[PDB]
Amino acid sequence: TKMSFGEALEVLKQGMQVYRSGWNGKNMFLFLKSSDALASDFGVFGNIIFIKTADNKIHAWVPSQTDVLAEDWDIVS
Amino acid sequence: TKMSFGEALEVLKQGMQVYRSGWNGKNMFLFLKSSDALASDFGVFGNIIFIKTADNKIHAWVPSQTDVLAEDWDIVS
Amino acid sequence: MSFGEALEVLKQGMQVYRSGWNGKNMFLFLKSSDALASDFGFGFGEYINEPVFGNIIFIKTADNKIHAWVPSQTDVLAEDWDIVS
Amino acid sequence: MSFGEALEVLKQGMQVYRSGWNGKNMFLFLKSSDALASDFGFGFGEYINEPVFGNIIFIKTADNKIHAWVPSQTDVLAEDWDIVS
């Protein structure tokens, strides 16, 4: 699978998890929690993209310029 | 107050809120939720920096290169 | 217009921006890895098969200055993107 | 060494890196607004009082290439920073 970031973004908006081929650390993906999600979660939030890093920790995802322009996005399956 | 980002970071690590002078939108600050904070919040998380944007919404903060090197950081008081 | 659409416009060499941005006269422009090899190559850019610089996205940050653009989560998920006339 | 310490080292013209980084031979280096005005100024950089480029932080991303560095939240809050020998 060779998706762009924009295509990988609509996949995130529909509740699925995406990852990149040329990423260094493994078992790594992104997931998007909506405001209502984050609200029922904790009580106003905006949409927040997270990342399950290699250490099984959840951090706020920071898009690198490479990740934004990359074409190697795939869906977790 | 003219703090660097590193000094503004230790202020975030002690549970205080920081902001920049040369920021465009107003009523804007950062705050840091720890893992244990985010855990008692919702159940493993890492440290996550947030930002109360101008629209009173909480987003995951993305550091611009300007914000990182800036010297106009101040504490909310 | 979403960010994914603004990306394809950026990769085609045009300037994009967000209406929801605070600043005025701000826009993103992309300098591809091959474009930088030509601008810094002195007519030898076509022969460089592995340029040093990767792709760099720039932003003219209202102050008539140019910085390297850091894509915020708000910009990535935004739908207020538009092309500079 | 924290990120704030790595910043002052970066502003002084030395290369920093994180041991917790996956990639090898990766390091950040800072190109100040005045440094870029000299390198692209042809001996006229000293007379430029308002350079076009702001400060740009770069990263040599293991592939022997250079990109504009996007500071992740992990790097910002990290304490595994170190100076390149």
The CA-based angle D18-C55-A51, given to 5 degrees, is 50
Distance of alpha carbon A35 from alpha carbon A48, whole angstroms: 8
The CA-based angle B38-B47-A58, given to 5 degrees, is 75
The CA-based angle D58-D64-D67, given to 5 degrees, is 25
Residue A55 is classified by DSSP as T
The Cβ of residue B56 has, within 10 Å, a number of other Cβ atoms equal to: 8
Residues in chain C closer than 8 A to A60 (CB atoms): 73
Q: Which chains form contacts with chain D, at 3 or more CB pairs under 8 Å?
A: A, B, C
Distance of alpha carbon B33 from alpha carbon A45, whole angstroms: 14
Resolution of this entry in Å?
Answer: 2.4
Residues in chain C closer than 8 A to B66 (CB atoms): 61, 67
Report the 3 state secondary structure along chain B: CCECHHHHHHHHHCCCCEEECCCCCCCCEEEEECHHHHHHHHCCECCEEEEECCCCCEEECCCCHHHHHCCCEEECC
Q: Which of C70, B6, C49, B35 is nearest to A66 (CA)?
A: C70
Q: Which of C51, C69, C78 is nearest to C15 (CA)?
A: C69
The experimental technique used to determine this model is: X-ray
Distances (CA, A) of C49 to C34, C46, D68, D80: 9, 8, 21, 35
Q: Which of A47, A37, A41, A34 is nearest to B41 (CA)?
A: A41
